[PDB]
Amino acid sequence: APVTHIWYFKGVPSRLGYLLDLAPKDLEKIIYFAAYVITSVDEEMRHNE
């Protein structure tokens, strides 16, 4: 299973958090299996339904 490089997730600037517009407190909860994220949503399938 894929894993995240610590050099980029964890640091004084969280580079992964900067790119993805999140926070390290809102990334450790995910790449360490504490909370889910919504990978993608269906926009039209929700607009008509």
């Binding site: 450790e28 909860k29 360490y32 504490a34």
Partner: protein, 59 residues
Amino acid sequence: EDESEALRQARKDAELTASADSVRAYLKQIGKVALLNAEEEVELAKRIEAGLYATQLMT
């Protein structure tokens, strides 16, 4: 005390914690399923027997 919103959301917030220690997080999660007794064990064993019988029938 226990009712009137003092302890319920208290329990929900206490459970909903960062749990930095990995063993601590695993023990927190394992504290979610109640223990079982003999009748429950034999009932679930019957269910598994039915499931494997149905799998054999599918095969």
